[PDB]
Symmetry: D2
Subunit: 309 residues, 4 copies
Amino acid sequence: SLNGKVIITCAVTGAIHTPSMSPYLPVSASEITDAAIGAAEAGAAVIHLHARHEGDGSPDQSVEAFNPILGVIKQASDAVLNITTGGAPTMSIAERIQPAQHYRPELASLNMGTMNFGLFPMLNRYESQLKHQWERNYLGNKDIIFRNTFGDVEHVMTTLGAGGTRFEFECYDTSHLYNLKHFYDRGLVKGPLFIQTVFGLMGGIGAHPDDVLHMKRTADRLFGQDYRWSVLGAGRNQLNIAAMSAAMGGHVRVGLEDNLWAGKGRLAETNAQQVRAARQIVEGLGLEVATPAEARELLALKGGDQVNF
Amino acid sequence: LNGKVIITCAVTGAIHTPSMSPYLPVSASEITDAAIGAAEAGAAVIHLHARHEGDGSPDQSVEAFNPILGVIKQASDAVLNITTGGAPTMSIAERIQPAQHYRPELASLNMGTMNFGLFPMLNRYESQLKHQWERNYLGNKDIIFRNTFGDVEHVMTTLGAGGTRFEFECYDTSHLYNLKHFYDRGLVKGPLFIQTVFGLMGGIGAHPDDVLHMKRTADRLFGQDYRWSVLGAGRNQLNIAAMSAAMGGHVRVGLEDNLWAGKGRLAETNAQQVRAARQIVEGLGLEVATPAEARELLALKGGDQVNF
Amino acid sequence: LNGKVIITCAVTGAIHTPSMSPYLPVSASEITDAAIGAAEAGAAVIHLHARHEGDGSPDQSVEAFNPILGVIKQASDAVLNITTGGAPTMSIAERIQPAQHYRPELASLNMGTMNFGLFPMLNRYESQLKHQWERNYLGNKDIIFRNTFGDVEHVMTTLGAGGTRFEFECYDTSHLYNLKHFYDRGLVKGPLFIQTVFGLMGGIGAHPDDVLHMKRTADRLFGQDYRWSVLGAGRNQLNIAAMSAAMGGHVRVGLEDNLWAGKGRLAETNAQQVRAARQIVEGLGLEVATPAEARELLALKGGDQVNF
Amino acid sequence: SLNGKVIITCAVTGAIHTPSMSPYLPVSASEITDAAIGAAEAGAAVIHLHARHEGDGSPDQSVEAFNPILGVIKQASDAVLNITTGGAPTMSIAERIQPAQHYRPELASLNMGTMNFGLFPMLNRYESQLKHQWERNYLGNKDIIFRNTFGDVEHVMTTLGAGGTRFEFECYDTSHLYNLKHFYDRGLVKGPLFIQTVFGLMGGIGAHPDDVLHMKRTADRLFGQDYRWSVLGAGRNQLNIAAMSAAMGGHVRVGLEDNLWAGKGRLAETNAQQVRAARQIVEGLGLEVATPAEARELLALKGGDQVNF
Ligand SMILES: CC(=O)SCCNC(=O)CCNC(=O)[C@H](O)C(C)(C)COP(=O)(O)OP(=O)(O)OC[C@H]1O[C@@H](n2cnc3c(N)ncnc32)[C@H](O)[C@@H]1OP(=O)(O)O
Ligand SMILES: CC(=O)SCCNC(=O)CCNC(=O)[C@H](O)C(C)(C)COP(=O)(O)OP(=O)(O)OC[C@H]1O[C@@H](n2cnc3c(N)ncnc32)[C@H](O)[C@@H]1OP(=O)(O)O
Ligand SMILES: CC(=O)SCCNC(=O)CCNC(=O)[C@H](O)C(C)(C)COP(=O)(O)OP(=O)(O)OC[C@H]1O[C@@H](n2cnc3c(N)ncnc32)[C@H](O)[C@@H]1OP(=O)(O)O
Ligand SMILES: CC(=O)SCCNC(=O)CCNC(=O)[C@H](O)C(C)(C)COP(=O)(O)OP(=O)(O)OC[C@H]1O[C@@H](n2cnc3c(N)ncnc32)[C@H](O)[C@@H]1OP(=O)(O)O
Ligand SMILES: [Zn+2]
Ligand SMILES: [Zn+2]
Ligand SMILES: [Zn+2]
Ligand SMILES: [Zn+2]
């Protein structure tokens, strides 16, 4: 019965885009919860969550920052809440791990390799618009290392896994799939693996169709039937890559964390706006958007009532 | 024109038979109704076969298109694309006669000789076949769709003289290489309307790797001098259409290629499949090409410079 | 057997003609000398055609192999692989007669109907063609190598009854899918000796992406139940052989497939191409398969259980 | 005339393998120079060089460590000398850059992205054989980050480029090709680009034929005709991947830096042994091994007489 069900994840704000880039980027806790609830009611079964300082909008990966967010969304929606362990790519593991460790979510992101994270491409378009000094230092930083060593990843699996949390394994290139294979063969994570292949980041693999098929092909060969595929296309590749995945039996992620645009010369005003576009592609293919309960079964999650919020 | 997707609708064809679906257009008026509805739903190109109204069998004669082409033209400015293949069991200088006489903007052109397999189609439909010609057709394990190098060279010369440009039908890698041979000799000038056909028994399959392989090969052989369209047979129709739309290509739908809408549900109109492809195209943030935009992308002569 | 590479040598074939090279074996004794030298250089399988000694044209009769098979068998324990294709312009129940009568361990089996293009070969050789049949053959733009689904099913049944296993000749993706159809019906049992042929006009090209595409497709359709061999036409012979050897596959060489040794240099013997492939195989740290190791990898009946 | 010429690089010792793994790993300066000269006389046009402490064989990336190596090889051979800027993957950029900066070689390696570097797979086979404590700490370290940020890479290009040195761009995955494309489009390096795609490392892309074709395909699309392709296959993939490259118009790297084995149950005794095997594949294909002078033309190098040793 779960055949032909597509899971839409909506990543509502993230840590990469900054407030000066768009007035529609959710910053406050109430903006983030409204964006999440609106996206779930449009058909997002999973909400991927970051938090921000309400003062200047900078990334906030503290336990307290999620307190006015998680419980509010849960009361209003049964969507699966996916808490970031990535935060801002400049953060340490000790900092990034605390929210998921405390709240024991059904799902948490797990980044699978250390990589350069380049943001200066966003300086070409946005430098003159930046209003906060932290935005200038952040996007100008040519030395960002998004740290996820083999020791880090093993520690996160062990720590968060004890609380029943399952992972969205974020894979930005082929090597991250091989890294995941290493832990999968050691039995440190069990199937079905929720593998998200991320396309178009500076420091990661590109967004060419060859890149998509290569990651899909590699995942197929390394993990067979024991994984569920999701994709993330950055910027204007968002909907193109979501459609490829939906057409190939995979799942999709949209959201203002990854793309600020709704069309040509047009910024996206809400996260739900992007969920509806993906949903239109899903239903045009003759498929159906998965409910949260259907996502929990496809991904083997512990249930929205087994969390600490 | 950068974000415009041409939807071609093939309304009846010659592979499916009337016993397979009551919605398959057969009579001339059913074909014209199907074509006009598909155009109004957003199909810029209509791909056309004719059939004998008696038993529904393929009819590739000149007169068969007479009550079809003019009727559609009067009601729509869609590009009319006349088959030169017909049923895969037919000859050449005769197969090109409809397009030769009517001088359409577009004609299909199959790029290689291949086996055509339909006897698995017999597995499910054998019970409900009404006409004897359907049983012989589908049970035939010796169908050869003939398109020799000499045949293809003849079509390009003969039909090119009428101002007709071609939709190059490519069912496997060899057909792209066959097209590269003629392209290099200058027998066809760009932009090439290359249609890669997936899922037929006797052709390449419909796996996503098959799609990317044909795309990569076309990119390497023809660069920027071609326009890519896809045809996904049967249940692969919309999946492969979505891949193409997402990769900068164009899409073909229609009851010639797929009789099914969902699970155990037959498609009732061609327009219904056009609407689905259109929903995908627009969900992607793209727009469906008008007939006028298709004519520019494909370098066609105009819907008023034909012989009908 | 894990690091053993089967070298097949195709000593003369039916595509090249005698005016193209004085080293192309024609007479029966030239073919047997070529086969024995290739086996002694390390070729475990010898792939065989016969020719008329009068003008060098293909000869696919039963008697044509009589002074060939027994001579080779007496001098070598190589696996003898008899063509069922002959010249691409030939019929079926007759084409299978040599293999039907002699009941070899191996027979070739072409898996699809395709165009065969040789008129570009005419570009360079037209000046030096001695026999009229060479000019008509190479200039023919209408060659159709016929292998319908019904034809192939007939060969599998008829020749399978003699204990003969097949080398499935696959010239494009569709031929692997065609083979998958018969494999699923149980008409051929593994391990399948699948030979992917690259570089022919009418088939897939010889680009590295073409090689990987055929390999990927075969892996997905047949898994571990097949043995992969490659044939790179002309100048691609050793490049594609090296890719296969490096990827766990097997290699085919021979003057049937390539007349050239280097730049403007004709290959003088089949053994010479076998030695080259062997140098590559051993440079990789692998070993060339003996005939006895080939028989185990391919599940053959034995060189003494034949009718010659 | 340079058509059909294959460049063989021989990497004689490296920094990854350790002395306890094989008694044939060159350690002393005289062992390294003998290995280099023997490999060049077998047909290696380029020698890729690391140095080691003669005491315990640990990696030595000091300027002084190359002093008894470079001049000795140059006097005995006209091979192109390729000095590592990678050193041991635990080293900083300030340390790793000094040899190439001082000696101004024709060629230096340039690693194109930050990555995990996993060596514990080598602990499964070798742990009981290790004789030095530094070997145990090194191979057991699950937290190795091979640092090559965008800022680092730009700095190395600028610094070493002023001395006429050209680069072997070491690419361990698709993202490193995209990283190189970024600098190539900014004009910070000029063609022909010597791009080496590295296969089989833990933390990098694997050694499956699909991985090889993917990297080749991506390089083709991003750089067209303006690059020269070399490959490195780790361990027992060394000769397989060298053959694929040679068959596809690329160049090859062998050496005990990457593979300790000559066959089944047989350690390789010399670097030249591996050069001869690759040469046998090259000549079996009907191609020819490039001379040093031919390598200098294919790679646009400044000449062996324009170095500071
Ligand atoms: C650790 C973690 O949490 S990792 C999370 C993963 N997310 C990320 O890292 C962020 C991903 N996204 C990004 O990095 C940024 O959005 C970027 C850098 C890709 C944005 O790049 P930009 O060049 O500014 O934007 P992009 O090219 O994607 O889209 C804007 C352009 O596309 C156009 N566009 C957008 N949608 C459409 C459409 N549907 N049709 C036509 N044009 C469109 C816009 O009009 C604009 O055109 P312009 O360049 O002429 O003005
Ligand atoms: C030279 C020339 O003339 S070329 C013309 C180009 N076109 C052609 O040649 C014809 C192309 N089409 C065909 O050949 C035929 O449609 C075929 C052979 C592909 C049909 O194959 P079949 O096996 O009969 O059907 P197929 O499996 O593709 O689709 C029907 C099945 O899929 C299911 N299905 C199809 N779409 C959906 C959907 N969106 N959701 C759920 N189920 C679906 C149906 O319910 C049915 O289920 P079943 O397999 O359990 O019966
Ligand atoms: C069903 C059946 O019967 S199937 C049997 C399977 N085999 C076949 O069908 C036949 C396969 N072979 C052929 O068709 C022919 O050999 C052909 C058509 C490929 C030959 O093509 P041609 O264009 O004549 O030759 P090709 O370019 O491949 O090789 C000769 C050229 O390459 C050069 N060349 C070949 N190898 C080398 C080398 N190692 N080094 C340098 N140059 C070389 C030659 O010097 C010559 O140079 P040129 O192109 O400037 O003249
Ligand atoms: C920063 C820089 O400088 S980066 C430089 C790049 N270099 C590197 O990073 C190092 C690359 N290499 C390595 O990492 C290591 O050599 C490793 C981890 C790959 C070695 O892995 P291992 O499993 O120990 O060895 P590997 O599997 O490659 O080869 C050994 C096995 O292959 C077998 N083998 C080797 N060659 C052959 C052959 N030709 N035929 C058959 N078997 C063979 C051996 O007999 C052995 O078999 P066994 O496992 O049954 O004992
Ligand atoms: Zn995130
Ligand atoms: Zn048609
Ligand atoms: Zn043959
Ligand atoms: Zn090195």
